[PDB]
Amino acid sequence: ELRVGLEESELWLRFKELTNEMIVTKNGRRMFPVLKVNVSGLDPNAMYSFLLDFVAADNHRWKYVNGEWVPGGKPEPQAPSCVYIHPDSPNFGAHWMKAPVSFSKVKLTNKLNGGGQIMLNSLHKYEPRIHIVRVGGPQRMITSHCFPETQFIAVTAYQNEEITALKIKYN
Ligand SMILES: CN1CCN(C(=O)Nc2ccccc2)CC1
């Protein structure tokens, strides 16, 4: 059985208990914490691409009102985010299993852009999700996995100073 684990869940959970926030910029901002995934049970000899996307966790716009995040009352459907390909892709199972797969190079933006960067809607809540895609073989296969511990709200600047403090303390 293919196993997918979050690395450093300890720390992600401290961010989640405060409501996590991730900065988006026109040019694209790298994430902290970085999503790092432990994977076992791949065929060491099979070929795989690791993909990262962001599900809109709800259909609402969120606002930081008197020190607390609160959803709006006017939900709109949220079209899916674009996919980020891990730059080690495509690669052997052995490659992916020798150390945590670290998405250190994904950039989050609020503006449609050349590419690389992934465009999110500011003040929406997102749940990171990976796809593990077996490629090159006869049988294509996809395994997907969400990471609720890594949920955040996309912001153009931090609202909760307790997040600001944690971001610096641990970087
Ligand atoms: C620079 N990039 C990195 C490697 N890459 C892919 O892995 N694409 C792909 C193709 C089919 C299924 C999943 C991913 C495209 C080029």
UniProtKB/Swiss-Prot annotation:
**Primary place of residence?**
nucleus
Q: Name one GO molecular function term.
A: RNA polymerase II cis-regulatory region sequence-specific DNA binding
DNA-binding region(s) in UniProt: 11-171
Q: Which GO terms describe its cellular component?
A: chromatin; nucleoplasm; nucleus
Expression by tissue: Detected in testis, but not in other, normal tissues. Detected in lung tumors (at protein level).
**What keywords tag this UniProt record?**
Activator, Developmental protein, Disease variant, DNA-binding, Nucleus, Transcription, Transcription regulation
Domain of life, per UniProt, equals Eukaryota
Disease connection: Neural tube defects: Congenital malformations of the central nervous system and adjacent structures related to defective neural tube closure during the first trimester of pregnancy. Failure of neural tube closure can occur at any level of the embryonic axis. Common NTD forms include anencephaly, myelomeningocele and spina bifida, which result from the failure of fusion in the cranial and spinal region of the neural tube. NTDs have a multifactorial etiology encompassing both genetic and environmental components. Chordoma: Rare, clinically malignant tumors derived from notochordal remnants. They occur along the length of the spinal axis, predominantly in the sphenooccipital, vertebral and sacrococcygeal regions. They are characterized by slow growth, local destruction of bone, extension into adjacent soft tissues and rarely, distant metastatic spread.
Could you identify this protein by its name?
Answer: T-box transcription factor T
The species this protein was found in: Homo sapiens
What stretch of the complete protein does the chain hold? 41 to 211 of 435
